[PDB]
Design an enzyme around this catalytic site. Structure first.
Site, PDB file in Angstrom:
ATOM      1  CD  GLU A 229      -3.826  -5.918   2.235  1.00  0.00           C
ATOM      2  OE1 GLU A 229      -4.605  -5.207   2.063  1.00  0.00           O
ATOM      3  OE2 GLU A 229      -3.078  -5.612   2.184  1.00  0.00           O
TER       4      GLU A 229
ATOM      5  CD  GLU B 143      -2.648  -1.134   2.376  1.00  0.00           C
ATOM      6  OE1 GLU B 143      -2.932  -0.346   2.932  1.00  0.00           O
ATOM      7  OE2 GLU B 143      -3.594  -2.257   2.354  1.00  0.00           O
TER       8      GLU B 143
END
Lengths: 597, 597, 294
Positions: free
Chosen positions: C195, C104
């Site tokens: 994810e 991220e």
């Protein structure tokens, strides 16, 4: 004294199942001769009808209390009624209700899941208000349907003990109207439709002994009078018929008509072309061999238990609809008016039961009475229970059986003997719809009483549950060889009425453990395979619909978690099986007993 | 324009809420086009009324549906209503409803939570069946109350968005009734009951009639008379100590008689003789400091949504009773008849609000200036909302304050322009009660609007949850120093109208962390600590009776768990905490300083 | 013992994966210990090594803080040494098929392309045997100044009807594919979603497939599924969390955040029952049929 549930036209009624009657408990006793029904109600508290008095106040000392409860409401009687009579009806007061009007005994009853009926305008004014005291009795004894024994504890802690699963919810569970009717009035009708694969021809008959003359108009849907014959009892005809089907429940409307020189009364009662009888080992209506798909139900809801709710009915029914069940037994008592409404309109087939349950000392899973009670005064009462129950649903197109009792003990002592005469009485009260009875776990050529007399043996068990705990494979072995056993003996159609498990709503695990979501699911379809693999099995009905409250003990937790849904209708993973299986069938027909390999 | 509550007397009322009605979704917008109110409602299923419609069917596309829906019902006018004024009311239809009584439109309404009744005889002759059609719409826009904003998809797909918390349930939530008065009838009343140093007095009476000469007598705790009254719209009556008080609820019974040359109308009104005033940072009732303890609530239950049901009302109040709650605020809209019902008999002190939540563009967790999307038009609707609530609740002694809005953003420029009139308006409507406007988190940075233009400071404080995550000592620091800020600044009484944390039901932690019962408890105890040491804090109302369903989002665990009780009314540990605190509290008196080091 | 080692947990979790049909996983947001060598090797379980390189935003409340004057030289050099130390360890391990360098990472504000590419170019110089990657957030349009080009298999992990489009499955699918199509072309490289998930409270059922119910996670998960195997480009699907796990302080997250298919104590949610039918009704290692005959 048989009756017809009100509707309107120049019969009108005033729902006065309002909320908030005054409410008092009778401890240190003393209510019945301290003339409580006037001079009204010191130190009461607000209570609503229809519903239980048990759970309303979130209090144990009220919840578990047994004995007499006082219920008192005022009401203005309508003007424009001074002409007609003023009949007061409770659709049930649970165990025992002694109605009064301003100062005098008006009615009395012991049924509890059936109605009362009394005052024809004579006691007080046609235009004013009049207080309505009720006295309710919780208690149960051996000559009471739902039998039990009350033990007065040392210095008066009167605890109640009973023999069934569900809790002893009491009080005015149902809508308590009062109604109007002219002095010639219909009363106590009876109908029924015999049919062939082509037609036809249902029956006129009734007790309008009041001043009336005869008129009978039968309608199809939408206000078209068809095939009407006018003498108290002459049968009718069909040009060609659109017949009552479980998918649709098309029903006719025939308006009974009682004529007079003084104030003639017209009544609307609908009716459905039901083809109900047994043939060999198969269950047919409109002469076809269909399948039962439901749950055993209960009248149990989260705040007003055993009490009526329009919402609960719209909703639960929506659940069933979605999940593919076409049927259910009112279990261990008569319900109210889901009968007429839902089953009729949506062609939902119901198996009427009686509040005939808990006839054992036999399952801790002391002493107590052994057939010197469960005797004459109790058989006669059991008699009157079947009276009162056929009185009510003898028209209802959704009624396809009369279960006379659930889980009755058939071995000890004088069982065949008490029981058969009741098979032989009911028979004499309806031969239109076959009668039944619901078995326990004793099996081998087995019942002295149940085997022969009944038309569709209804057997509800848990074959890897309280014995064979969680052994699915042997439980299947034992399951079929004992369905095979039950198969031959009676060469009649066999419906399993309570098949289930206890599952805690939120419990998952890898090892399909007991009390997990994935056990109930594995377990349930273990049944499934031996089920549809037996010609004889024609009805499968999962035991409980939702978790529901149960008496005190261990074996049972917050009720006992035996529902496919939870008490608040949130669905367990089992609802997801019984909705794939149950709708991946063709309507009403046994699945393939084997799929090609 | 002007109504009173149907009570039964020489007025009689027929309840028309069996709520078995035919429901349809006007999925494309044609109901009105194809004149649906004038024929048999097609595709119409069975639904309950009173009840929300979103949850009844266990269907997703019905729940989050947004246009229009119809309610169809065949009904029966009483014979006896001969030359009677026959009016049809709905106690509430939530966002919109126009009523066709058999192809006559009689009434339409906007307020979602208040009554609307229209009619005299012309549109129905007695003794025959009328077919009533209701069009209910559930859309919110910038002129609606609450406000709302509807997004239309690329394809006439309508998806409603709003700025409040709780789910936007719509349908007939409350009772619908046909009710009758003679052609002379008291149309409205108004009472104001002064008291002086407690032994004493005055009960002002105002009046308006439908062509009659009002005689008035205020009569009873025991039914004996105790004052008499002059004519249309004049009075002051005077006597001794018997009052209406927070503890008990003691109410007199004032009846209104009107008189034309032939006709008569007697209406009864209950009267609580109580004083409600705010003097210098104390909220005096019958002239002594009072201390609120209680709940912010919602009209929210498990299958009926915002629908109304007696049982809950009887249970929830047993729970408020047990916990020791003396007060509540109707948290976001007017509630139905828990006002007289039960707030009046047991002298529960209520704060009642209008439907105005979400005048805020800030609380997420298309847009830009909170004005000319909030109009002099909305201001109008708002004033109308207020007007309709004071209208209905004017007499209830339960109600000790008016809240004209919940958590509006008062940073923008027009906030003060918008509220000041609404402020002055509600006071000219009922001078007898203090007004208030429930506060979001703002203190010097609270800004223009009218904490100063209002009478008692109601503060919503759902703090650590959002601002100082799970921290107690930092959270205590700012709470107290903010509370003091509001003392110095406004010197008015302060009520904490919301304080608590979302708490999963059974989640226990040895580290009290967020969403654990242990935590809810600490957080609630922290608050209390600081309340108890700030004098101007005259009341605490914990935010939430029970977990209630919410709109969409992440912070929203299905039916976000804001409650002390579960949605099925089960106590989280935090309930027993409040039981000790509140009943440990000698009644209605603020604790002197609550802990001490 | 959180983040701590247990022989049992390893024998067991691995048994779960085995049963449920997953052949892979990323050590997420840090390096693990010795499940590497043991399990992945022995059972041919393919792992995507990550670094404890995570939390490079002020960008998701879902203040102030430093804006690229930190996340600077001493921190890049440290990020350097992190990739040093991590290749040092698993450079042999047959189960290592990538090196995720960070999870991220914020790619828009200020000096992002510039800090980052030199680290793509160092690691490269430490292993060219196994392709390197990096794991994307929700900004997409021809998008990253830094991530787009330098890496070999874009690894994108998102929740397309979760924190926005809350519970709107059908539009979220619309938006999902047209944005996989978008991600498809731009880089003509293989795309692995790393994810994908939802938050679901273990014991919650409801009829309306509500948010946070068992039957949402299930419906939601297979909404992805259909647009997934319907895109040539997608080669890797990895559900976000295995089990519920503890999370920092805040609201959005409850008892951890209930984002696991299993619960912290390994009791399985109804989603474990999907991902075990789907995941074993595949042929070993091969994309399912992107369409089945009609």
């Amino acid at each position: 004294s048989h009756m017809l549930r009100p509707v309107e036209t120049p019969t009108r009624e005033i729902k006065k199942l309002d909320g908030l009657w005054a409410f008092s408990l009778d401890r240190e006793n003393c209510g019945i001769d301290q003339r409580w029904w006037e001079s009204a109600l010191q130190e009461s508290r607000a209570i609503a009808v229809p519903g239980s008095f048990n759970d309303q106040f979130a209090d144990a000392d009220i919840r578990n209390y047994v004995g007499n409860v006082w219920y008192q409401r005022e009401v203005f009687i309508p003007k424009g009624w001074a002409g007609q009579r003023i009949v007061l009806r409770f659709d049930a007061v649970t165990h025992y209700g002694k109605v009064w009007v301003n100062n005098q005994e008006v009615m009395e009853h012991q049924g509890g899941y059936t109605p009362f009926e009394a005052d024809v305008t004579p006691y007080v004014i046609a235009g004013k208000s009049v207080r309505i005291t009720v006295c309710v009795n919780n208690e149960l004894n051996w000559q009471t349907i739902p039998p039990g024994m009350v033990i007065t504890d040392e210095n008066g802690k009167k605890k109640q003990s009973y023999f069934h699963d569900f809790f002893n919810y009491a009080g005015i569970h149902r809508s308590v109207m009062l109604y109007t009717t002219p002095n010639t009035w219909v009363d106590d009708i009876t109908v029924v439709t015999h049919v062939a694969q082509d037609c036809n021809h249902a029956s006129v008959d009734w007790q309008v002994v009041a001043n009336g003359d005869v008129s009978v108009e039968l309608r199809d849907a939408d206000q078209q009078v068809v095939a009407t014959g006018q003498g108290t009892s002459g049968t009718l005809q069909v040009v060609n018929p659109h017949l009552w089907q479980p998918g649709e429940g098309y029903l006719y409307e025939l308006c009974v008509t009682a004529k007079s020189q003084t104030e003639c009364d017209i009544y609307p009662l609908r009716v459905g072309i039901r083809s109900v009888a047994v043939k060999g080992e198969q269950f047919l209506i409109n002469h076809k061999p269909f399948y039962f798909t439901g749950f055993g139900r209960h009248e149990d809801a989260d705040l007003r238990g055993k009490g009526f709710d329009n919402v609960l009915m719209v909703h639960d029914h929506a659940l069933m609809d979605w999940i593919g069940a076409n049927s259910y037994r009112t279990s261990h008592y008569p319900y109210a008016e889901e009968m007429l409404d839902w089953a009729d309109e949506h062609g939902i087939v119901v198996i009427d039961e009686t509040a005939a349950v808990g006839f054992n000392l036999s399952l801790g899973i002391k002493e107590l009475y052994s057939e010197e009670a469960v005797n004459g005064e109790t058989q006669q009462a059991h008699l009157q229970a079947i009276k009162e129950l056929i009185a009510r649903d003898k028209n209802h197109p959704s009624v396809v059986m009369w279960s006379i009792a659930n889980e009755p003990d058939t071995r000890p002592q004088g069982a065949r003997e008490y029981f058969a005469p009741l098979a032989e009485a009911t028979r004499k009260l309806d031969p239109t719809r076959p009668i039944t009875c619901v078995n326990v776990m004793f099996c081998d050529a087995h019942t002295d009483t149940i085997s022969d007399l009944f038309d569709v043996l209804c057997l509800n068990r848990y074959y890897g549950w309280y014995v064979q705990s969680g052994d699915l494979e042997t439980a299947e072995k034992v399951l079929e060889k004992e369905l095979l056993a039950w198969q031959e003996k009676l060469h009649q159609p066999i419906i399993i009425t309570e098949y289930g498990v206890d599952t805690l709503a939120g419990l998952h695990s890898m090892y399909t453990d007991m009390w997990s979501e994935e056990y109930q699911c594995a377990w349930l379809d273990m049944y499934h395979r031996v089920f549809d693999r037996v010609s004889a099995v024609v009805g499968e009905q999962v035991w409980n619909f939702a978790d529901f409250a149960t008496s005190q003990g261990i074996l049972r937790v917050g009720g006992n978690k035996k529902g496919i849904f939870t008490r608040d209708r949130k669905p367990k993973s089992a609802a997801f099986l019984l909705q794939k299986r149950w709708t991946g069938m063709n309507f009403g027909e046994k699945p393939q007993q084997g799929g090609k390999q």
